[PDB]
Amino acid sequence: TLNLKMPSPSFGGSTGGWLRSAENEEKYAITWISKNEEVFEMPTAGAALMRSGENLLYFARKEQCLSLGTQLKTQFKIDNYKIYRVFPNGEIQYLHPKDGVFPEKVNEGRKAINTLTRSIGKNPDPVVVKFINKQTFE
Amino acid sequence: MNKDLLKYLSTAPVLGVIWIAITAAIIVEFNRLYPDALFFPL
Amino acid sequence: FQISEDTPFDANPLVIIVALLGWTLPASIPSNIPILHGTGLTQAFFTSIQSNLAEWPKGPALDDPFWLYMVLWHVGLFIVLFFGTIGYGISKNRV
Amino acid sequence: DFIKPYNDDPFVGNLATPINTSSLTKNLLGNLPIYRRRLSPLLRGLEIGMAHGYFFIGPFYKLGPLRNSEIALLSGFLSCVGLIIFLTVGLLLYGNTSFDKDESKDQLQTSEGWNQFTAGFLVGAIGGAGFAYLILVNL
Amino acid sequence: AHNVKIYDTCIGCTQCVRACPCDVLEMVPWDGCKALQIASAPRTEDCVGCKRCETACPTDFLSIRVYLGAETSRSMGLAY
Amino acid sequence: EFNNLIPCKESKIFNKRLESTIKKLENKLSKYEVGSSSYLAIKNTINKTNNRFHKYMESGVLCGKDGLPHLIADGRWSHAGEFVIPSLLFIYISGWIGWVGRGYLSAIKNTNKAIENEIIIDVPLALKFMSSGFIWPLSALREYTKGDLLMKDSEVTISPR
Amino acid sequence: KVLIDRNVVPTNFEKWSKPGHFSRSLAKGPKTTTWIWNLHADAHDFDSHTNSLEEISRKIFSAHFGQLAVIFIWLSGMYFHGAKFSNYVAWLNNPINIKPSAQVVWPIIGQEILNADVGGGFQGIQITSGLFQLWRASGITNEMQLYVTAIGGLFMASLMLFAGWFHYHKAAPKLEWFQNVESMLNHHLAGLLGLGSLGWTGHLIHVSLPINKLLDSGIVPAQIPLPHEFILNRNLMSELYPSFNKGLLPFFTLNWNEYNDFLTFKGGLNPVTGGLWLTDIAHHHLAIAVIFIIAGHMYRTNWSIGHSLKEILDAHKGPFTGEGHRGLFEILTTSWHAQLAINLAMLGSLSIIVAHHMYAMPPYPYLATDYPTQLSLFTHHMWIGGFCIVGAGAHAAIFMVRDYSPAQNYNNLLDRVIRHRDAIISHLNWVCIFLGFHSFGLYIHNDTMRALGRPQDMFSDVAIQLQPIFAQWIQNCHSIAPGNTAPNVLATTSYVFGGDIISVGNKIAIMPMSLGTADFMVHHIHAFTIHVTALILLKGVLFARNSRLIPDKANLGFRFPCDGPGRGGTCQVSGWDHVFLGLFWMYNSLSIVIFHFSWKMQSDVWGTISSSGDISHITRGNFAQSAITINGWLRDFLWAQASQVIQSYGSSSSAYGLMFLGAHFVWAFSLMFLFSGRGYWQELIESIVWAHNKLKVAPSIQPRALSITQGRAVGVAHYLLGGIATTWAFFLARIIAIG
Ligand code: CLA
Ligand code: CLA
Ligand code: CLA
Ligand SMILES: CC1=C(/C=C/C(C)=C/C=C/C(C)=C/C=C/C=C(C)/C=C/C=C(C)/C=C/C2=C(C)CCCC2(C)C)C(C)(C)CCC1
Ligand code: SF4
Ligand code: SF4
Ligand code: SF4
């Protein structure tokens, strides 16, 4: 579960943050644990102060969360971050890391989606799928 | 003559410029001494 | 009065009074240059106000000294007002 | 000090400044017909119409192609009515596409509410233009 | 959504997964290559179509391919 | 044929061009003192102009109704100097440049400095090839018949079709 | 403290034959033609070569000596051409009736036609650099003095080249030396600017003043004493300026009014030469020298006295601006890009100020009635200014990508700017749309009304007037200031504001410039074009590191083509791409400035006066009625004034005809690069490579199409060269014929 009452980094605010679409379509949350108070760069621009302990931020896009995640990992060696999608109705999907392990590391249990049992040069010609719903890359 | 200097004089732009300048000079000098050759005289 | 969201601001009108007196007094020291006559900028401006109000509807012409007096007088007034507000702000621990 | 996160939320895309959150700003905006409390959509539209119709005649009267004729003001008035009709159709089109069965608790953000507002705007605007004509034709 | 496909010339280097800024991709077990893993695209609803994955892929021709398709708010990268 | 043209020595328009050109130069000449550097410069232009017009007059180049030399490039030998002979000269020189350049490229590919010798020329090697260009037509012809000029179509890369 | 490391870098030619030695990426050598372009593009990007700030600083300092050497060679060349290949002396004797020339062409393939009839028995290219007027003001009266200055220039060049070598290879300063910003400022204010100005005052008083006074009285140059005669024989000076009889006693006793004969406050212009009074110029430089020498005692160096720059900055914070200027001192002592950004912005802005000030207050004798020189100098200095301003944007963006850190900028002014970048850019966007509509829109209104036969409905002086009343009022203040708000000044700073028509020969030097509707309109065009150029560059800087579209943009760097076709398409998001676009708008903006200048001066200022006093302007006052429509600019400016350049074949101006066409060609060729993309070109190259492979003549360095970014760079560089050289040729051909 997320925990909506988790505290946030210290930040004076900006105009780069989320707009109406975050309220009535979807927004994203990233949480992490830091050992110490530390300044980091907001993906919406500006310096913010990481609390020691738990940290919660909301963003409009998944890419903003992951961008921050990459910064946490690279600059601060924090790899305990979690990303969630938050709907207006209150529902919460956990997104990343999906199964506990980062996607770049092989993990048993995962199943191949969107793989093909051929090389790219063995796709059929467009004319063959003319007047049917198939694609050449299906 | 110093081998490193000679290697530098062998680089594409240096040889490029020297060779084009000599070629250009030859054409200039032909036209300075035999001007206005619209055709081969015969 | 709140200058922002939840930020009460003093807005003390003594600043305006002190500023106005602080400028108007020294600006009334007389000068020798032809445009100011033998009076100061304050007097010159006030005289031009009267002379232009004498022609109520007709506004001052371009070439009327009025415009130079008005601008010069206001430049000085606004500088004193500006530093006066900042000074009062320092006293009230705005920083 | 004077600039703060908007609604005490630093991750919302806005800042609280003097221009948007001072007491003067809140006093002005709150009392404008579009925001003011205990107004029907019709009356909101009527007040807005009147204010806009009144000022619309000035440009047409003084700068239009018939400004130097004896009928300058009448041309001014007809131009306003023209402008007002286009704006009303704009309002009709906006309401028609923007609202459906969703009966929101604002009122105005509804099909019926927006139609009352549009009615107001039209009548108010021709009225205000009319009132401006009567002042100018005398004075 | 954009279509992302992984072809059987994949050598399981992981570079596409590392390149992806939207977490569309992941490595799954496989027998087909020495690395004993293949790239997978389980979350193409989050794919923006930036093609950083293809830039990262070392094989010739590519083993990962992005076919740009039906646009959504997600795919267009809108924060409004 | 070429009834619309006339020899430039028979052309009245071509002669008037000389007269008008010189007349302008002599007006320019009158602005300067005899013996001055400026005066001598203008005199050289006058001499050069006269030489040019007289050279064309004595050549048997044809003139249009504009009174300007028009060149015939259909192959007839009475106008060989106007295009055919320049053409042979160009082909001989350009073929040389191409042939010696192709020879150098191939020589360095048979070394460890195949790339280095493209940006830093092996000048002795280059001069050897440049010196050998004078019989490029025969060289190229023999190379063609030996089957050394061209790669086979199956040995050159192509895209899908 | 002087801190140096000795014998750092050996001097040999080893690395000269190792292209791209300076970069890890390039040192491995080419596999592809892309490497050849990368070598050149990365040669002076020193901070990409190494992480060491000390190493970067040393290269820069040494490169600067290299630049100074090049400038001395160029300067030396100008003096030498003056001495050897010019009509300077002839011009000196008769400056009203001789055109300056200091370039002569060799007689090859008929090009000697370019040696124009400039007078003084001389034939050569007419120059527009203003060198002759400069040299006259300096008191140079013969070719020997030019020769010796040329030689001194070659000596200085060699000295700069030695210092560059020495301070890189032999005695390279440590980083701590470069970060002595307080000491640098003290020396550049008091030493470079202060003593420079004092030294020049010395020249002015002892050399320029006497020689020019004798020239202007009508003494023949050859009959004037040499400069040292005035120094050794004080009586020669005292004849011209009697206060020299009193010597230096007035100076030390503060009886400075005694020197009011050679230190003046006249204003206006010398009536003989049409230039500023040299006695005013002398006094200007003395005053400037004093102020600068005082200014250079502000900062603390090796003693207790003076300010810390850091302390000043840290104190300036208020209730609207968080931590204020905290952290800026660290930025400006650790980032060369941050320094370059400021210094380019100011140097560029200054060049533009010089353009305006020099036309209106012509400082040299016989400058004002040398119309080709006036037009050339204004135009040249405007362009230099524009390019520098765009550079400021480039280096501000490079700083944001490479040198900015959040920890250094917590709640300071820089942090707070980027935290409301949407508010800044949205408002600037709006002001640009507003300005565009209410400036250019007025021309379109006018074109439409005039085409429809409704001149009474136009914005014009004789219909709906838009008078620039504020500018008109300022003109009036400046015209009445002498003897009033400036009581001890005798005449206006400039006759452009009002007053007399100054004429030299029968040519107008300077006269009042009336401002009407046409002037109001074109001023708002300038406001518009400058705001848009600012928008593009500011946006580049504020969004260099990230945006809503690309949250990790900084990791992609300053210069990258895009982040792929996704998110709708992301071409040209980088900071570099904002500079690219900003160059076109700077070009657009400055083109209209120089066109405004050219037309306004010809219509309303330049021309002839009769003895009766009847002014005849070059284009006869057509600006007021023609410059208020686009058709008027197309017809009465471009079409009408292009007659000179377009009819130049067969004359000494034929070079300009050729350059005009050539420049149109280069401009059009640029569009091939700007409108296309490399995918097309790389495919075409594949087929061509097939033919080379077939004939066993394919290179081992594989041909590639230019990078996406290089395509853009090549495009804008040809667009600017073609566009600017077209105007150059247009302007020179015209002004040399009629002026
Ligand atoms: C873009 C600038 C521009 C401007 C300023 C003008 C101005 C004018 N045009 Mg021209 N015109 C233009 C461009 C422009 N035109 C272009 C691009 C074309 C296409 C070729 C034309 C073609 C054209 C024709 C065919 C005609 C005109 C005519 C006119 C005149 C009357 C128009 C009118 O009545 O509008 C009505 C104006 C309004 C309804 C409102 C204007 C905007 C208001 C004032 C903004 C106020 C904002 C406010 C400050 C915000 C404060 C908020 C807060 C304090 C509450 C007027 C002089 C007519 C004429 O007779 O000329 C003499 C005419 O017949 N124009
Ligand atoms: C293509 C057809 C078209 C026609 C027939 C007109 C006709 C006119 N335009 Mg032009 N105009 C057009 C296209 C057209 N416009 C376009 C595309 C542009 C943008 C470039 C303009 C820009 C333009 C400007 C800037 C101006 C005009 C003006 C005029 C009027 C000038 C003659 C006059 O003195 O009347 C004097 C005007 C009147 C007596 C008022 C007539 C108002 C009518 C009765 C209102 C009717 C509205 C309509 C029935 C509403 C329903 C339509 C829709 C919602 C279903 C005339 C009515 C001038 C004008 O006076 O406009 C107000 C004017 O200033 N036009
Ligand atoms: C030895 C060098 C060499 C040789 C034998 C060829 C031969 C050929 N080229 Mg290639 N080409 C070359 C260099 C060479 N090229 C270079 C350097 C470029 C880059 C500009 C090209 C770009 C190029 C294009 C775009 C095209 C060709 C084409 C062709 C073919 C037709 C003729 C032509 O259009 O030339 C035109 C080529 C030029 C005008 C480029 C200038 C050639 C330079 C001057 C030669 C350089 C010589 C080299 C530096 C000598 C060093 C030798 C020394 C060290 C010993 C022919 C197979 C065409 C083709 O494919 O037809 C089927 C074609 O479309 N070439
Ligand atoms: C300048 C200024 C400003 C602003 C202003 C404004 C913006 C104004 C506006 C105003 C307006 C804009 C107004 C209006 C008005 C209107 C009116 C007054 C109306 C009336 C009406 C009537 C009376 C009637 C009506 C009617 C009729 C006729 C009948 C039927 C219908 C009806 C009922 C509707 C400010 C404050 C900022 C500041 C100071 C200065
Ligand atoms: S196109 Fe971009 S977002 Fe989509 S899978 Fe590839 S890297 Fe990820
Ligand atoms: S980058 Fe290419 S080869 Fe490597 S894991 Fe991804 S698809 Fe496979
Ligand atoms: S068109 Fe070119 S610049 Fe634009 S996204 Fe595609 S590759 Fe990048």
Numbering used by the authors:
A (entry chain D): 4 to 141
B (entry chain J): 1 to 42
C (entry chain O): 55 to 149
D (entry chain L): 3 to 141
E (entry chain C): 2 to 81
F (entry chain F): 29 to 189
G (entry chain A): 14 to 752
What's the publication's text?
Red algae exhibit unique photosynthetic adaptations, characterized by photosystem I (PSI) supercomplexes containing light-harvesting complexes (LHCs), forming PSI-LHCI supercomplexes. Oxygenic photosynthesis in cyanobacteria, algae, and land plants harnesses solar energy, converting it into chemical energy with the concomitant production of molecular oxygen. This light-driven energy conversion is facilitated by two multisubunit membrane protein complexes, photosystem I (PSI) and PSII, which orchestrate light absorption, charge separation, and electron-transfer processes. Various light-harvesting antenna subunits bind to the PSI and PSII cores, optimize the capture of solar energy, and facilitate the transfer of excitation energy to the photosystems.
The structure reveals a monomeric PSI core bound with seven LHCI subunits. The PSI core comprises 13 subunits: PsaA, PsaB, PsaC, PsaD, PsaE, PsaF, PsaI, PsaJ, PsaK, PsaL, PsaM, PsaO, and Psa28. Encoded by the nuclear gene Psa28, the Psa28 subunit features two transmembrane helices that interact with PsaB. The seven LHCI subunits in the PSI-LHCI structure were identified as the products of seven genes: RedCAP, Lhcr6, Lhcr3, Lhcr5, Lhcr4, Lhcr1, and Lhcr2, at the sites of LHCI-1 to LHCI-7, respectively. The G. sulphuraria LHCI-1 was identified as RedCAP, a protein with unique structural features distinct from the LHC protein family. The characteristic structure of RedCAP is largely defined by a loop region inserted into a cavity formed by PsaB, PsaI, and PsaL at the lumenal side, as seen in the PSI-FCPI structure of the diatom Thalassiosira pseudonana. This distinctive loop, spanning residues Q103-T123, is also present in the GsPSI-LHCI structure. The PSI core of G. sulphuraria includes 99 Chls a, 22 β-carotenes (BCRs), 5 zeaxanthins (ZXTs), 3 [4Fe-4S] clusters, 2 unknown quinone molecules, and 6 lipid molecules, whereas the 7 LHCI subunits include 69 Chls a, 25 ZXTs, 4 β-cryptoxanthins (BCXs), 2 BCRs, and 5 lipid molecules. Most of the electron-transfer chain components of G. sulphuraria are identical to those of C. caldarium; however, the secondary electron acceptors could not be identified as phylloquinones, which are present in PSI of most photosynthetic organisms, including cyanobacteria, algae, and land plants. The A1 molecules of GsPSI-LHCI were provisionally modeled as ubiquinone-4 in PsaA (orange) and PsaB (green).
